[PDB]
Design a protein around this nucleic acid. Sequence first.
RNA 1: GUGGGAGAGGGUGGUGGAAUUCCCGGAGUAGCGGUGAAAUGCGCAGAUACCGGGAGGAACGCCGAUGGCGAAGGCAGCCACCUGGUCCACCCGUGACGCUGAGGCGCGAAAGCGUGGGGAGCAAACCGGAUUAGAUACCCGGGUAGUCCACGCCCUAAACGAUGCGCGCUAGGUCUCUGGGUCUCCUGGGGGCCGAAGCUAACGCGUUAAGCGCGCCGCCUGGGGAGUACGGCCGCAAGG
Lengths: 73, 115, 101, 88
Amino acid sequence: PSRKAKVKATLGEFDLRDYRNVEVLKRFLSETGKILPRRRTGLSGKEQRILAKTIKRARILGLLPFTEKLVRK
Amino acid sequence: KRQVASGRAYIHASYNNTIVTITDPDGNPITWSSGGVIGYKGSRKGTPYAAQLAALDAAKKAMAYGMQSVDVIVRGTGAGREQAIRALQASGLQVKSIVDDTPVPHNGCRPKKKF
Amino acid sequence: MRRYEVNIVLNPNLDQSQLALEKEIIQRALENYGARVEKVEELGLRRLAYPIAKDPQGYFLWYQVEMPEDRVNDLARELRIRDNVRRVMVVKSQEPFLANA
Amino acid sequence: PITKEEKQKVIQEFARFPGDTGSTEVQVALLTLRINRLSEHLKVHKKDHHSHRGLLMMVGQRRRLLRYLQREDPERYRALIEKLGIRG
RNA sequence: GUGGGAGAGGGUGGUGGAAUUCCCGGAGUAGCGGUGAAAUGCGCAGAUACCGGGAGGAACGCCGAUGGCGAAGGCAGCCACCUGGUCCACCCGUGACGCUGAGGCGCGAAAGCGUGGGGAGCAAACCGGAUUAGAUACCCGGGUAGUCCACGCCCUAAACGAUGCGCGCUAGGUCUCUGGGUCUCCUGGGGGCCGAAGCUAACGCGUUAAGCGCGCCGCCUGGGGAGUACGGCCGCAAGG
């Protein structure tokens, strides 16, 4: 169904371009290190496009992961 | 006897044979069991039963080292990945947590004919 | 000239005396390439998502400078010289894009 | 890249009367700016066949106008090249 | 002209993490690998699976779309610089300066050619393995050119929307990228699907026209023989 709860709905005003704000971004990453699809982020054509670039940045400054491991299976 | 309680259990599954290696907290393997080591030699190793056995005889060799606790690490998709885990969950070992860290490239080596 | 954000990450196990040594450099290397600093935020130690150069932590620097267009790539070249400064990243300063507001 | 600073300077340099932003004189002046800027950039990056088009295009336009000049007042044309420095 | 905007448009330099192979160390045994089955191969000089360390080339998950950009070929990790196209708003400036476009010049996927560099993965040919009535194959294990880089040449293609460029005109509905607005609605540019009139041999097309029309270029005129022969032009050659 994917009708859990979008991350935009349960969050506040926040800058898409501040690639240092890890406390937030993490909200946009999966149980693994992957980037949540728009169905999950709640974002727009333009927003997601940006949030995309931003994460790839914080990744580089060793802030956000590139891939995690899984806890179940 | 070497008395090494609590360790790691890597489970390396394939589409041609499933194996298991039991390593110590640090990462050094104590005793390792495959499928072709049990008795089976070909199309047989891919079987979930093959994996079952591979898992169980792999713990029996650890109980010899007094292994009690274990963290499970799965590598890949094989045929009976599950049955291997469910195996250890009944072998007599305390299963901490199952980890999935199967190796996915981020697009590197051009894979061969069969993708 | 243009606005920039200068992300510099270096060794976490640096002591008082050693740290202010690397800053002094960074500092002297800026006026060397004509970069007026407008401000700088020192966040400090933050746990890395992944281990960089075998070490799980890192010191964080930020430098909003106003330097020459033609000498940006160079500015980093020099920065990426100290065997301690492990990460460098310069960005054009982009008007902050709000969302969910 | 060209700046407003430099660009408006060029205009003021060619315009027929104060407060004019679009006349052949000007039109041409401006192209030439970009062209020269382009050319110089094509001495390096000889692998930029893409920008090389836009170039031909610009040049196409440039000459397209001057032809228009030799049409109406030749006086103005004869004097524009000297002020830019064209031909070759 | 001024003020905004969006983009895998191109070029250069740089730099990030995954995985792969190899090398070294650690630990550890008897197999590993591969298939419909199998074998060829690799392992007691100790492989496999596992940890740590190092080298190197290629490429760049997720985001990523039925999306964007570009004239096409084509283009996606991140960053900076250099650079082309374009759209919107204001309606300011020139004053018809416009469209097309033989030959020409430039660009032009893949493979392929020269010299040099590089070589992780993959892999024509070639070497073996199995399959079969046979197998110069489809499957398995190797593997050289090549595939990556530079400079130079080659210039073809289902180089396809199989639909030349440019302008006007002719119901809408809906989804989407993108800009302005008085923004539950209006308004511009673009991508899709359905569909009026109309067209169409039909399929289909249908304000992204294959509709009603004007300009200009390109091309076709039974099949095979042939994209051959001859001739010329090009190219180092393959050839075009």
